[PDB]
Amino acid sequence: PQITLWQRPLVTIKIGGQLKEALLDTGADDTVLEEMSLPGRWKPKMIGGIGGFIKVRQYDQILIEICGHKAIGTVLVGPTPVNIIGRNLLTQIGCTLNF
Amino acid sequence: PQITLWQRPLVTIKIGGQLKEALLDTGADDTVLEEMSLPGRWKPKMIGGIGGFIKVRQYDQILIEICGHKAIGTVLVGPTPVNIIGRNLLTQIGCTLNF
Numbered sequence A, B: 001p002q003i004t005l006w007q008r009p010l011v012t013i014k015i016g017g018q019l020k021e022a023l024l025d026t027g028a029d030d031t032v033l034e035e036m037s038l039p040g041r042w043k044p045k046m047i048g049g050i051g052g053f054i055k056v057r058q059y060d061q062i063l064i065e066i067c068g069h070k071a072i073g074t075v076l077v078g079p080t081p082v083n084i085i086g087r088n089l090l091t092q093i094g095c096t097l098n099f
């Protein structure tokens, strides 16, 4: 797919059998999802955004399907404005910026 | 060019004669730059993201050169930790997301 940026690059992701909307974000190093229950243990992580830092819970080896493309990696869960798909998962699905 | 996401998508921009390094961010609706002096009248604006909201100065119709490509648009100036090139200018240089 080729996605133009006249609108927000929102896609549907499936995680835990649920469909959610997520923002393809090249300016995000990590993938940060809104509050939800993920399996296993979690480790602590502090991430800095535009307004400062927030504490998130990191889960490893989580399966997440982005537009029919399966990816397995680190997902952070916390008080985020929207579900964000960062570079860690963007590289797994073969996403690039072109101009 | 084609830019991979293994590393942060940083590019050189020229604004007001000054050369700066900025991030090509598809998740950003706007373009926000670190504190600097731009000519003209500005308007106070409040923008938010991870960590909360920050107060910025809104300058309209500013010309920026992103890798030679010229683009005109609104640029917000404020306490951002990284210079961000958002969707408002990314569209002007024909930037697209592919996978």
Ligand SMILES: C[C@H]1CC[C@@H](O)[C@H]1NC(=O)[C@H](Cc1ccccc1)C[C@H](O)CN1CCN(C(=O)CCc2cccnc2)C[C@H]1C(=O)NC(C)(C)C
Residues within 6 Å of the ligand: A025, A026, A027, A028, A029, A030, A032, A047, A048, A049, A050, A081, A082, A084, A086, B025, B027, B028, B029, B030, B031, B032, B047, B048, B049, B050, B081, B082, B084, B086
């Ligand atoms: C993802 C994080 C993990 C670690 C960092 O990588 C970090 N990345 C970022 O936060 C980067 C900036 C950064 C890069 C590198 C180092 C430090 C900081 C910004 C992000 O790509 C864009 N971001 C997405 C989520 N957003 C939304 O949904 C807004 C919705 C909304 C709703 C109602 C009212 N207002 C807003 C806010 C938006 C943002 O910040 N946009 C502006 C115009 C402010 C820049």
